[PDB]
Amino acid sequence: VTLWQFLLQLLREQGNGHIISWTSRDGGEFKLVDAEEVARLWGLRKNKTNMNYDKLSRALRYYYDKNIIRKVSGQKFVYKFVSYPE
Amino acid sequence: VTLWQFLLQLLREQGNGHIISWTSRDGGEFKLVDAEEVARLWGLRKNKTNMNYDKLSRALRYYYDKNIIRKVSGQKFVYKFVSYPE
DNA sequence: TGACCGGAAGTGT
DNA sequence: ACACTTCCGGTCA
DNA sequence: TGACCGGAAGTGT
DNA sequence: ACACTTCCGGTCA
């Protein structure tokens, strides 16, 4: 499972916005409300308990040149799926 | 992703027990608090909006002979992972 | 002074 | 081959 | 009278 | 080959 797919799953599956939330769903923009918790969970998808936001954020940065995800400048922990979140 | 893996993910990732919850964790027993919602989400993992509990429960029944999951008799919506999770 | 950035080497399939 | 993972030195507000 | 059960045929990789 | 998915007739409490 890829990081972007996982993020999409969390946004779809969480019952609330305590750890992740759409900021502007129309635009595919979302915020990692509890970045370290989202990272913990991401690491656990690979059976690791040590994933943190510094490493997950780097993975997201790796997406910039792939035109998969981009940063929403000026807003902390907010990112944007460039290809409509379907 | 398999149904049992998905269930394990929900139990690990949900911030509360509004749709799924461990009943006796060391025993690997859990309850589908909102069975139809858990089913909806399961279907969406495969890009389908029509998965319901009747079909998901059948998938779980298919697990009985595989010694992966068993029913916790006498309790509605409660099942048991036979192989230690966490 | 914390979030964000990107190079460079390593991991697991 | 590919999708990150792991470090981490440096920038920006 | 709803949750649970299991046969039998079909789907997608 | 495998892991369900889809129907659904019947049981149990």
From Swiss-Prot, chains A, B:
Gene from which the chain derives? ELK1
Which proteins does it associate with, and in what oligomeric form? Interacts in its sumoylated form with PIAS2/PIASX which enhances its transcriptional activator activity. Interacts with MAD2L2; the interaction is direct and promotes phosphorylation by the kinases MAPK8 and/or MAPK9. Interacts with POU1F1.
The name this protein goes by in its record: ETS domain-containing protein Elk-1
Q: Where in the cell is it found?
A: Nucleus
Q: Which residues bind DNA?
A: 1-82
Tell me the organism. Homo sapiens
Found, by tissue, as follows: Lung and testis.
What family classification does the UniProt entry report for this protein? Belongs to the ETS family.
Q: Which domain of life is it from?
A: Eukaryota
Q: What does this protein do?
A: Transcription factor that binds to purine-rich DNA sequences. Forms a ternary complex with SRF and the ETS and SRF motifs of the serum response element (SRE) on the promoter region of immediate early genes such as FOS and IER2. Induces target gene transcription upon JNK and MAPK-signaling pathways stimulation.
> How does the record describe the protein's post-translational processing?
Sumoylation represses transcriptional activator activity as it results in recruitment of HDAC2 to target gene promoters which leads to decreased histone acetylation and reduced transactivator activity. It also regulates nuclear retention.
Show which stretch of the intact protein is covered.
5 to 90 of 428
